[PDB]
Ligand SMILES: [Cl-]
């Protein structure tokens with residue numbers, strides 16, 4: 001575990017993270033996809049061997065010795081708000097299990113279902129709170145990666161609120 005487990009946020013490409021493992025915002029079919037998923041595919045293409053997994057689950061594939069945790073959030077274009085919320089919560093609980101099993105002291109994580117899977121809605125608070133519910137009982141240093149300057153401020157404020 002980390003000596004004093006923390007949350008941090010950085011506004012940069014998760015493919016250039018400084019953590020002991022990465023969470024991919026994956027699609028269920030293990031396809032190269034777009035956004036975070038395409039950057040992850042470019043950086044760790046070996047990690048996409050048998051990475052396909054259902055919505056609401058996470059599957060880890062090693063790139064050399066570096067673990068890539070493929071976490072499949074719901075596409076809110078297809079799910080009801082209620083079912084989508086349940087699957088989004090589940091994907092993050094499966095991430096917490098994998099981070100614990102791997103014995104890492106740190107993990108880089110994007111906000112699941114906040115991009116092309118958002119169904120056109122702002123889900124920063126919804127996705128971040130599900131992230132907190134899952135990861136609060138783990139002792140890894142969590143580093144959240146985002147690309148928008150306003151999101152970086154909003155994520156930083158939500159972290160500091162609990163401190
Ligand atoms: Cl960058």
Ligand SMILES: [Cl-]
Nearest residue numbers: 114115116117
């Ligand atoms: Cl997304």
Ligand SMILES: [Cl-]
Nearest residue numbers: 146147148151
């Ligand atoms: Cl963002």
